[PDB]
Design a protein around this nucleic acid. Structure first.
Ligand code: GTP
Ligand code: DZ4
Ligand code: DZ4
Ligand code: CO
Ligand code: CO
Ligand code: CO
Length: 218
DNA sequence: AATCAA
């Protein structure tokens, strides 16, 4: 059925480090040094465990990347948090328009707390520095707003013997809030059938990202 | 019970 298919698709889409992943706990993240398996993602989908995925594989390539749009410390102010939520959506729209201009299929996720991830998937892994370079150049073309931060994952071009950086992956529970981390549409509305949306996510052509990298400069 | 990174 669609739901077990989505388990195998999740594995193929959020494939990062071959033999290490992470789990979100209250107060941080903990590396689990073993390959991810089916049960780990059933724990993810059920709310039992929440998974993060190290982007960089051992040869310093990634099969996916993501923008991380954050509403920074609102704290008190005048409960104007709405303006900053509005600002987070404007910034994501701006990033997303540039991605479609460059013909890069991408997907929005509500993160369960203060923002949105923009996910880009590839059919074959590409060099971490290439897509990082692309995503910095696109960030540089757009206006930003007060209270908003934009982070680019991968955060490093190369492991240097380490693990690199991880990102919490969708369809699970943000421990900080109890909310589901869910895909939304082009106007930030929650998809009703999260499973079917996942089963229809399209991968970009690695052969077209590589050409774009060179064209973006040379 | 809690790491690793920029
Ligand atoms: N690897 C790693 N990344 C972290 C850690 N803490 C924060 N980050 C990441 O670094 C980003 C910026 O760090 P901070 O500005 O200190 O965290 P923040 O919670 O966004 O800060 P404010 O919202 O401004 O209070 C966060 O949004 C995370 O992506 C950590 O302990 N390890
Ligand atoms: N202590 C840690 N150790 C390792 N990785 C960590 C980490 N804290 C965060 N990360 C990693 C995991 C995170 O997924 C990623 C982004 O950090 P956020 O922006 O702070 N958290 P998210 O975007 O997922 O949801 P929201 O912002 O709405 O609260 O950095
Ligand atoms: N004076 C106004 N007139 C019309 N809509 C208005 C408005 N003030 C606010 N709105 C609101 C009501 C509308 O729901 C909303 C539309 O704003 P986006 O979704 O950000 N722009 P688009 O529709 O083109 O989306 P996309 O690019 O993906 O195709 O703005
Ligand atoms: Co962040
Ligand atoms: Co975030
Ligand atoms: Co619209």
């Amino acid at each position: 059925g669609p739901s077990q298919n989505a388990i195998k698709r999740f594995m193929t889409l959020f494939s990062g480090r071959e033999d290490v992943f992470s789990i979100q706990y209250e107060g941080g993240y903990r590396p689990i040094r073993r390959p991810l398996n089916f049960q780990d993602i059933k724990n993810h989908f059920s709310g039992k465990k929440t998974l993060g995925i190290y982007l960089l594989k051992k040869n310093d390539t990634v099969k996916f990347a993501a923008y991380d749009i954050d509403i920074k410390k609102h704290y008190l102010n005048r409960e104007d948090k709405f303006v900053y939520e509005e600002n987070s959506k404007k910034v994501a729209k701006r990033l997303s328009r540039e991605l479609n201009l460059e013909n890069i299929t991408h997907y929005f996720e509500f993160t369960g707390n203060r923002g949105y991830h923009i996910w880009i998937f590839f059919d074959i892994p590409v060099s971490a520095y290439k897509i990082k370079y692309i995503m910095e150049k696109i960030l540089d073309r757009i206006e930003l707003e007060e209270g908003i931060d934009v982070e680019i994952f991968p955060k490093q071009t190369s492991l240097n013997g380490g693990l690199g950086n991880l990102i919490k992956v969708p369809l699970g529970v943000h421990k900080k809030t109890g909310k589901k981390c869910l895909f939304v549409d082009n106007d930030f509305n929650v998809i009703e059938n999260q499973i079917e949306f996942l089963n229809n996510i399209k991968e970009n052509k690695a052969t077209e990202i590589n050409k774009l990298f060179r064209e973006i400069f040379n």
